[PDB]
Design a protein around this ligand. Structure first.
Ligand SMILES: *CCC(=O)N[C@@H]1CN(c2nc(Nc3cnn(C)c3)c3ncn(C(C)C)c3n2)C[C@H]1F
Length: 280
């Protein structure tokens, strides 16, 4: 995978898919000059660094090549930075599980857990700390295949860096590890905490974590030992994996490689681990 530099004339926006503080994502079409091939894409237009700095950030971004992480296909630099990325036709997984909650079985849920762990393990191998894992940031290529994406919070660790020490950026408190909330420290193991919350979101068909509770009260609740409750469909074996992801000692949490193994085992006999009516 390599980075392509695109001219504005190579692609067109068709419609808005979503927006946020990061900018706007459009559904789009890309036709590389003279290639005659039409490629459906998602165009992320970001809301200034030197062009060379931006391209260097994009070159590393384009080198991220894994079945469960969204890839950057090209970039266009004008008055704005536009990132041309793989299009995920079905949108964010959070909305997907909310919409299809009546028709989702144990096989799909556990397969998604495996895939997300595989994507995160790949990011860890690349020394990337994600810092924003949540069901809203997992996207659906097909019902059977999901991919993680990033909207600016991910950081690359240097060879000697074991953690990222954050500054003043706004934080998704309810998905964060306690050490991140208290000390602005982020590691692959704090990503594991966020993975646990993401799995809880999936198993509750997209329910809100610490629902109705002010973000400012979360660290105090976690310090008292309280955690998100066992989802109705979860056997205790699955809930205990979640609970391991939220242990106070980051080093005692499972690593993504371990999570791949454990959820893969469960995915082999899905109805043994998640209890869903009509499944099947
Ligand atoms: C629940 C989170 C959410 O809605 N986030 C929006 C959507 N988004 C996004 N969306 C798609 N595809 C899509 C298809 N149908 N819908 C409703 C959305 C994406 N494909 C690829 N990407 C990124 C890699 C750029 C997509 N991002 C992000 C946010 F705007």
């Amino acid at each position: 995978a390599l980075l392509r530099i695109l001219k504005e004339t190579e692609f067109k926006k068709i419609k808005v898919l979503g927006s946020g503080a990061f900018g706007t994502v459009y559904k789009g079409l890309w036709i590389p000059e003279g290639e005659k091939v039409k490629i459906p894409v998602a165009i992320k237009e970001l809301r200034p660094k030197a062009n060379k700095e931006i391209l260097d950030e994009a070159y590393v971004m384009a080198s991220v090549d894994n079945p469960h992480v969204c890839r950057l296909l090209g970039i266009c630099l004008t008055s704005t930075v536009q990132l041309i990325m793989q299009l995920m036709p079905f949108g964010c997984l959070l909305d997907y599980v909310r919409e299809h909650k009546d028709n989702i079985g144990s096989q799909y849920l556990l397969n998604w857990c495996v895939q997300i762990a595989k994507g995160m393990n790949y990011l860890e191998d690349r020394r990337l700390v994600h810092r924003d894992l949540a069901a809203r940031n997992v996207l659906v290529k097909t019902p059977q295949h999901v991919k993680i994406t990033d909207f600016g919070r991910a950081k690359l660790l240097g060879a000697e860096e074991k953690e990222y020490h954050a500054e003043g950026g706004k934080v998704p408190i309810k998905w964060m590890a306690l050490e991140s909330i208290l000390h602005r420290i982020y590691t692959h193991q704090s990503d594991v905490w966020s993975y646990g919350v993401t799995v809880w979101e999936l198993m509750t068909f997209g329910s809100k974590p610490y629902d109705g509770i002010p973000a400012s009260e979360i660290s105090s609740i976690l310090e008292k030992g309280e955690r998100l409750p066992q989802p109705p469909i979860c056997t205790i074996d699955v809930y205990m994996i979640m609970r391991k992801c939220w242990m106070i000692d980051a080093d005692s949490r499972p690593k993504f490689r371990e999570l791949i193994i454990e959820f893969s085992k469960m995915a082999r006999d899905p109805q043994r681990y998640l209890v869903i009516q009509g499944d099947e």
